[PDB]
Design a protein around this ligand. Structure first.
Ligand code: SF4
Lengths: 204, 117, 466, 83
């Protein structure tokens, strides 16, 4: 957790921004290609410049990093708005992540991130174009041993910003279930020492 | 060699998704630019399963270098002095990456001075 | 005329595959700088030493007046008669009164109002800037005076109209008073011609002129163009070593990185400098590199910008910065005079001409933002022997003491002004000497590089699409 | 060999210098009302204005004091690190 958090946050930011841009979740005019977005990105990743969207993405990534000790799968679901049905699912496996109980040069980490993001972009390019006008996205995680929404039964008298952040992050999730022609396409992840991440995608 | 180069290009194009340049062949096989361009052209053939985008550039007269985009209407075809394949792009946006390269023995032109330590 | 595959088959299948031994690579032509260690770099100042414009103005006025008086004495010497009568010498502006020709020396006074865009830019970043347009509209114009410490006279006529002028420039007006305190203009004298080094007749190589790299974290196409330039300079693309090996040196003339200094942090600038260092390390073993500070580069806002630093570069370049390896890498002051194989070339990043062009002058009725107008401005800069006519804009406090380096002391063989919107070359004959003026365009947009021959002084352009 | 602290030093110094240049340009443009001049002797006259009713004067004098401030020691530190 020394340098793992920063690289993981950068990778999550690149992943979310690429998925938003290439699936037309937000207008392409609001995205710009850049390498610095308060962190040196491994590539020229198109990052949205809407302040509310940036804050939302950063908060979600921080929450996921906080809960990383108990979550083994992070998914961004693409759901239509005419009906609440998921049409595309991108799964980011976290099978123990090779957690650093006790850390490697940044160059190889960025090279592996470049390979994984290039695989993701190559998969996304061949997908059919998605129309504008109310296509939206959704975030779902798969947990091992946790229970959220139950930390507000003691009146949670906050004292500092850390306690308020913990309370708001515990209460910002709801319980969901596991739920044809589902097509599974495995992608390229990172095989570096500290970070062992597997990438998946779903269609239909 | 048409075998090591093809294997390296296939690896760098499919195993680790990254655009491959002819300069990559120059640095890997320790060959001159002309041999690298010929090997790239050879790999362009025998490609019944085409799963990449070719980035081709041509050299005009008056020392002008252009990147072909339209691929249908190339202006001033009579003034072309050279045309080759610059890279194989597995994605749509080229956007390559550049790193530190040790040109110990792959240099075709060297400056008159030598690095003194 | 044919499909792309046909051209690829025609060109690639007939590859030469010759002369590429790769064990004995062709040696680049040797190009040296005679000013690497000689003495007294005029533009090398001390930042620690640090309004002082009064002394600079006095020195400039004295030197220019002395030179113009010498030229006038050479040209308008006693005994020179006009068509009707003899011309007299007048020391003060008030002595030119009569129906006889006469000449006097004084500074030129013009309006030179600021452009509205500059006014808006400075107003938006001051927090209390007044309506500066009122300063120009209250006066509500188009005239030129001649100030020589005794008054001013209006310079009417036609010879004075067809010449661009900047305030503070002294001249040798020779005319006739006609009907009022307005003085006609018939001939104009400039400072006496300066010495020039002899042309080194003789083999000889060329030098590449590139400026305006503008390495930004938002535009990746500029990185592609820089990589293509790196490949072309190494002979990987042209495949004609017999011509590539003649390019002795590469010259970057500023604007390596583009950023907003008002809102910037260390990380993104460090990323850009690491990219620049990667390019340098990948190009240094094949060719020598000379780097110049730019207007938007991380160097002093004034015009005499000192060399960058030994730092701000990757650790892979630490071998070149040990001090012994200066012929392959050299960081230099923004204005400099390279003695390339005896060919003295003066290089300016273009801040002076850019600062002159931000003024709207209600004069010179007989170009608007054209290459010809800027070329005429540069020619006037050589004529006036003043690199920076607009001292309050380009120059800073304490340029020097009693000897301003920006006043020319020796005309160079080749004059370079970089970071210009358009490219253009023009040779001018001033006092029997020949100076070549080169306008280097920006590389970020229309990324042309100028190949200057050191044996015949011909500038050929190389254009890279993307 | 240090590209972190020196880069911040240059960032601060260049921001200060550009702010000072903008203030001087504004003062020169305002003094054009009286001087009707653009070159030298206009900025010299503008530098002698001591109007207490305009914030630009306060900003200009603050910037001038800050240029002559301890930044001289900061420049010396940069010189030592560069060497
Ligand atoms: S008064 Fe305010 S505005 Fe007028 S010159 Fe002095 S500072 Fe500039």
């Amino acid at each position: 957790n020394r340098w793992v958090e920063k690289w993981l946050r950068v990778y999550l930011k690149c992943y979310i921004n690429l998925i938003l841009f290439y699936r037309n979740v937000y207008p392409p005019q609001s995205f710009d290609y850049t390498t610095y977005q308060s962190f040196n990105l491994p590539q020229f990743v198109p990052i949205n410049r809407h302040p509310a969207l940036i804050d939302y993405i950063e908060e979600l990534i921080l929450d996921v990093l906080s809960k990383l000790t108990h979550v083994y799968r992070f998914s961004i679901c693409i759901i239509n708005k005419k009906n609440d049905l998921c049409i595309e699912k991108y799964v980011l496996d976290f099978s123990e992540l090779q957690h650093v109980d006790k850390i490697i040069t940044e160059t190889e980490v960025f090279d592996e991130f470049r390979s994984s993001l290039n695989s993701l972009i190559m998969h996304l390019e061949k997908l059919p174009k998605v129309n504008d006008d109310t296509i939206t996205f959704e975030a779902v995680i798969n947990a091992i041993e946790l229970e959220l929404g139950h930390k507000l039964d003691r009146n949670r008298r906050v004292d500092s910003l850390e306690e308020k952040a913990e309370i708001e992050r515990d209460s910002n999730w709801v319980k969901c279930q596991e739920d044809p022609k589902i097509k599974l396409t495995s992608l390229v992840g990172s095989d570096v020492g500290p970070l062992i991440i597997h990438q998946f995608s779903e269609k239909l | 060699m048409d075998q090591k180069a093809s294997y390296f290009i296939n690896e760098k194009l499919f195993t680790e998704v990254k655009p491959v340049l002819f300069t990559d062949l120059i640095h890997h096989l320790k060959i001159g630019p002309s041999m690298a361009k010929k090997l790239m052209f050879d790999y362009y053939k025998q490609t019944t399963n085409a799963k990449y985008n070719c980035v081709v550039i041509c050299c005009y007269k008056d020392q002008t270098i252009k990147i072909i985009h339209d691929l249908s209407n190339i202006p001033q075809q009579d003034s072309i002095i050279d045309c080759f394949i610059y890279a194989f792009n597995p994605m749509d946006s080229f956007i390559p990456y550049y790193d530190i390269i040790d040109q110990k023995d792959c240099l075709t032109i060297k400056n008159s001075y030598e690095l003194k330590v | 005329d044919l499909h792309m595959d046909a051209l690829l088959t025609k060109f690639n299948e007939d590859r030469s595959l010759q002369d590429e031994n790769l064990s004995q690579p062709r040696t680049r032509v040797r190009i040296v700088d005679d000013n690497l260690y000689n003495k007294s770099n005029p533009f090398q100042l001390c930042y620690k030493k640090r309004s002082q414009y009064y002394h600079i103005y006095q020195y400039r006025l004295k030197t220019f007046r002395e030179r113009v008086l010498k030229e006038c004495d050479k040209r308008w010497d006693a005994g020179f008669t006009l068509n009707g009568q003899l011309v007299l010498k007048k020391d003060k502006v008030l002595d030119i009164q009569g129906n006889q020709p006469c000449w006097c020396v004084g500074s030129i006074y013009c309006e030179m109002k600021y452009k509205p865009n500059v006014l808006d830019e400075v107003i938006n970043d001051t927090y209390g800037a007044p309506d500066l347009t009122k300063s120009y509209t209250d006066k509500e114009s188009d005239e030129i005076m001649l100030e020589d410490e005794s008054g001013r006279v209006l310079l009417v006529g036609d010879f004075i109209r067809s010449t661009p002028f900047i305030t503070g420039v002294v001249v040798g007006i020779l005319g006739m008073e006609a009907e009022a305190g307005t003085f006609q203009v018939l001939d104009i004298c400039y400072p006496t011609p300066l010495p020039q080094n002899p042309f080194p007749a003789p083999t000889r190589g060329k030098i590449a002129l590139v400026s305006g790299l503008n390495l930004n974290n938002t535009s990746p196409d500029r990185l592609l163009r820089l990589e293509i330039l790196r490949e072309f300079l190494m002979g990987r693309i042209n495949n004609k070593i017999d011509d590539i090996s003649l390019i002795g040196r590469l010259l970057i003339c500023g604007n390596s990185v583009d950023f907003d200094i008002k809102s910037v942090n260390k990380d993104e600038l460090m990323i850009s400098l690491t990219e620049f260092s990667k390019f340098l390390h990948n190009i240094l073993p094949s060719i020598s590199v000379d780097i110049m500070p730019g207007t938007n580069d991380p160097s002093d806002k004034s015009l005499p910008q000192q060399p960058f630093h030994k730092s701000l570069f990757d650790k892979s370049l630490e071998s070149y910065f040990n001090g012994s390896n200066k012929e392959i890498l050299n960081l230099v002051t923004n204005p400099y005079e390279f003695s390339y194989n005896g060919v003295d070339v003066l290089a300016v990043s273009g801040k002076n001409i850019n600062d002159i062009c931000k003024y709207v002058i209600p004069s010179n009725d007989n170009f608007k933002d054209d290459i010809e107008h800027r070329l005429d401005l540069m020619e006037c800069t050589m004529k006036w022997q003043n690199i920076a006519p607009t001292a309050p804009d380009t120059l800073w406090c304490y340029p020097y003491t009693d000897k301003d380096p920006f006043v020319l002391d020796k005309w160079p063989h080749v004059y370079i002004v970089a970071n210009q919107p358009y490219f253009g070359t023009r040779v001018v004959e001033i006092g029997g000497k020949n100076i070549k003026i080169i306008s280097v365009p920006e590389f970020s947009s229309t990324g042309m590089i100028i190949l200057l021959d050191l044996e015949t002084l011909e500038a050929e352009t190389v254009k890279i699409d993307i | 060999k240090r590209s972190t602290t020196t880069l911040s030093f240059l960032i601060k110094k260049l921001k200060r210098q550009k702010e000072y240049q903008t203030l001087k340009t504004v003062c020169r443009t305002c003094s054009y009302r009286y001087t009707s001049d653009a070159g030298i002797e206009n900025d010299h006259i503008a530098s002698k204005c001591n109007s207490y009713d305009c914030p630009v004067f306060y900003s200009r004098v603050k910037a001038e004091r800050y240029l002559r401030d301890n930044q001289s020691v900061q420049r010396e530190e940069a010189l030592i690190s560069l060497n």
